[PDB]
Write a protein that binds this ligand. Structure first.
Ligand SMILES: Nc1nc2c(ncn2[C@@H]2O[C@H](COP(=O)(O)OP(=O)(O)O)[C@@H](O)[C@H]2O)c(=O)[nH]1
Length: 305
């Protein structure tokens, strides 16, 4: 009932902006940064500047230790801001300073308060270099000590989904959108009950990550749109391990007012059949008027090990 999405650092705050622009519902947004100037560019209702003393608003200089210590200075304000949450999503681009460093501390504060804590983060594009990958690897492992499940999106695989010619700015804009899909794919099912009923317990069921959780997405229009979206999702480059390996699968089928009963059963079957015969599968369905001929299938896969 109280669901918070907390964007952490530049990339995380940009994802939260995307979510706000797509008018994702049922969540309260918090933006967090060590850089006061970038924080001023956030559309989140709540704008939290961490490490005022340590950084004087000037950011974390790509250093995870400064992000970590900024969040420790601001420990009590983060506690305050997260008070009363049943569920907390922590999004960030891993590899920089504020995200890598502060997102785990924020995740752990969420968890200590009793919130169901899901992380949705990206691993950096190879083209950002070896130093970024290494800092990201470090933050990813810290993060999964601090959350109930960590969805890790490998940015390289986005290049296999967007066109050959894509400058950086645009590549990073599609990373905002995959982050948004990871959060929304879950939150949409929980914010409002749904025609398929789906409570917190259903979600806690699959919310058990040792191992990085992975996500697949599939979009389609036309007359076989259901099977084509389902198939694309279980086939997404973002899903770096076959879905048949996962202990847990959450499926979200989203469409417009003409999403059909037969399509929901079709997609549910395609995804279930590609999965292990002993899988714990929970799924839901949501209507989004803004979609017309388009359906979106999202699969979140957990418990690979
Ligand atoms: N989703 C998204 N990711 C970004 C963006 N810019 C950079 N990144 C990624 O996020 C990582 C950290 O960047 P940034 O968030 O600016 O660092 P931070 O503010 O110190 O946490 C980078 O290594 C990139 O892979 C962006 O605008 N959107």
């Amino acid at each position: 009932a109280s669901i918070k999405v907390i964007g952490v650092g530049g990339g995380g705050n940009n994802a939260v902006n995307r979510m706000i622009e797509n008018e994702v519902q049922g969540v309260e947004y918090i933006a967090v940064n060590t850089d006061a100037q970038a924080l001023n560019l956030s559309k989140a209702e709540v704008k939290m500047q961490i490490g005022a003393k340590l950084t004087r608003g000037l950011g974390a200089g790509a250093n995870p230790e400064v992000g970590k210590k900024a969040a420790e200075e601001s420990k009590e304000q983060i506690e305050e801001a997260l008070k009363g949450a049943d569920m907390v999503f922590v999004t960030a681009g891993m590899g920089g300073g504020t995200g890598t460093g502060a997102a785990p501390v924020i995740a752990q504060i969420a968890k200590d308060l009793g919130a169901l804590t899901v992380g949705v983060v990206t691993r950096p594009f190879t083209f950002e270099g070896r130093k970024r990958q290494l800092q990201a690897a470090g933050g990813i492992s810290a993060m999964k000590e601090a959350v109930d499940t960590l969805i890790v999106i490998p940015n390289d695989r986005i290049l296999e989904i967007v066109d050959k010619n894509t400058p950086m700015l645009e590549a990073f804009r599609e990373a905002d959108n995959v982050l948004r899909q990871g959060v929304q794919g879950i939150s949409d099912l929980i914010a409002t009950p749904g025609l398929i009923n789906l409570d917190f317990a259903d979600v806690k069921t699959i919310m058990s990550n040792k191992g990085s959780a992975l996500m697949g997405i599939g979009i389609a229009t036309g007359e076989n749109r259901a099977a084509e979206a389902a198939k694309k999702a279980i086939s997404s480059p973002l899903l770096e391990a076959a879905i048949d390996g996962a202990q847990g699968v959450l499926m979200n089928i989203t469409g417009g007012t003409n999403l059909s009963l037969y399509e929901v059963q079709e997609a549910a079957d395609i995804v279930a059949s590609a999965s292990d015969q002993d899988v714990n599968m929970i799924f839901g369905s949501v209507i989004n008027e803004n979609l017309k001929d388009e359906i979106v299938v999202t699969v979140i896969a957990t418990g690979f090990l």
